[PDB]
Write an enzyme that holds these catalytic residues in place. Sequence first.
Site, short mmCIF file in Angstrom:
data_model
loop_
_atom_site.label_atom_id
_atom_site.label_comp_id
_atom_site.label_asym_id
_atom_site.label_seq_id
_atom_site.Cartn_x
_atom_site.Cartn_y
_atom_site.Cartn_z
N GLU A 1 -6.05 6.43 -2.70
CA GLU A 1 -6.10 5.44 -1.58
C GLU A 1 -6.54 4.06 -2.02
OE1 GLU A 1 -4.92 5.07 1.48
OE2 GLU A 1 -4.00 6.94 1.15
N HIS B 1 -9.63 8.17 2.97
CA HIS B 1 -9.65 6.79 3.46
C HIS B 1 -11.07 6.25 3.65
CE1 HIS B 1 -5.61 8.22 4.90
NE2 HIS B 1 -5.25 7.06 4.36
N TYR C 1 -3.99 14.38 -3.08
CA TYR C 1 -4.48 13.71 -1.87
C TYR C 1 -5.63 14.50 -1.23
CZ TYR C 1 -0.34 10.58 -2.09
OH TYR C 1 0.59 9.66 -2.50
N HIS D 1 0.84 -1.19 0.00
CA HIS D 1 0.00 0.00 0.00
C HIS D 1 0.88 1.25 0.00
CE1 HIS D 1 -3.66 2.38 1.26
NE2 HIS D 1 -2.69 3.18 1.68
N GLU D 2 1.83 1.33 0.93
CA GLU D 2 2.66 2.52 1.03
C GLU D 2 3.53 2.72 -0.21
OE1 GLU D 2 1.49 4.35 3.01
OE2 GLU D 2 0.76 3.11 4.70
N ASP E 1 -10.28 13.94 7.24
CA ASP E 1 -9.50 12.98 6.47
C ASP E 1 -9.31 13.49 5.05
OD1 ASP E 1 -8.19 10.49 5.87
OD2 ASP E 1 -10.10 9.61 5.26
N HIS F 1 1.79 4.23 -3.22
CA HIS F 1 1.70 5.69 -3.22
C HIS F 1 2.85 6.33 -4.00
CE1 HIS F 1 -1.83 6.43 -0.96
NE2 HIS F 1 -1.39 5.85 0.15
ZN LIG Z 1 -2.65 5.30 1.69
#
Ligand SMILES: [Zn+2]
Length: 316
Positions: free
Chosen positions: A166, A231, A157, A142-143, A226, A146
């Site tokens: 996301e 998210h 974002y 996941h990271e 958020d 990005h």
């Molecule tokens: Zn993320």
Amino acid sequence: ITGTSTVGVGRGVLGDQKNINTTYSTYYYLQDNTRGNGIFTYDAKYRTTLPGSLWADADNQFFASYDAPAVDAHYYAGVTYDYYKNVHNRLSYDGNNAAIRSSVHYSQGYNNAFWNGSQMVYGDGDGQTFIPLSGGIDVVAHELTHAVTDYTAGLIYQNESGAINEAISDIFGTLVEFYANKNPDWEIGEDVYTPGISGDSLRSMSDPAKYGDPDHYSKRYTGTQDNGGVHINSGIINKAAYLISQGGTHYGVSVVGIGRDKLGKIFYRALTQYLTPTSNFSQLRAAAVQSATDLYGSTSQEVASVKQAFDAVGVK
Ligand SMILES: [Zn+2]
Ligand SMILES: [Ca+2]
Ligand SMILES: [Ca+2]
Ligand SMILES: [Ca+2]
Ligand SMILES: [Ca+2]
């Protein structure tokens, strides 16, 4: 550092033993020379100063409990690099073999992980809500995803473009989990979330609403928390992706599944060829349809299943 490539052994966060690529020069360092310009793992020593110190070890054995998060961050960065190379012909996150850097032991009791624009960073968690976050391969992927998104589409974002940003990371985090193929599922973070409670996870792609996330566009979050729900509203896209792959009937709309490999191919093409920094959900649908068309023809089952998936979640 400059040295001799070798292979060490250690134990990861969940107690599993694995081999890791290290480099020897007086000490043994977590530096994998076998993948692009390298994978580098650093110790942030419970501080917020980055990147910290390149991880050095005296004997090339990594069985100390302090070692575990580093072992896994190092090893799962490698798996993710292999997924992108072998499956999508992409060399590292920038497509030109950029070195991958991760720091572990970030701060104290830090319940998160992130890409900071230049490297990945992993907290240890508080032992209650999270154990060290590099222990989840879906979290690592996941990271790192990005970084891929930042070098390609560049989705901002915020708001819908941020929710897409996301979802892409959840989708590819999950595909990389299935690639490594040890108990893969459609949940996010289950290996490192709430060690005291079995069967839960941070987010679900198969059923986002299980944790209060929307699974239909009519249920989208419109506030400011958020960053406009990046998210939260990702659940809408995650459900679409789950449906395209696995199939199912959702709010009365039936979708024929076309499987994970085709899902990955369609979404990777949309990401790298058609999405832009300000793309919204409707533009994602168009990009995904055009991708599937490119790959399988306008009259394919594949294009059909993409359309029904997005109809099922209410994205026109
Ligand atoms: Zn993320
Ligand atoms: Ca050692
Ligand atoms: Ca799993
Ligand atoms: Ca998972
Ligand atoms: Ca749990």
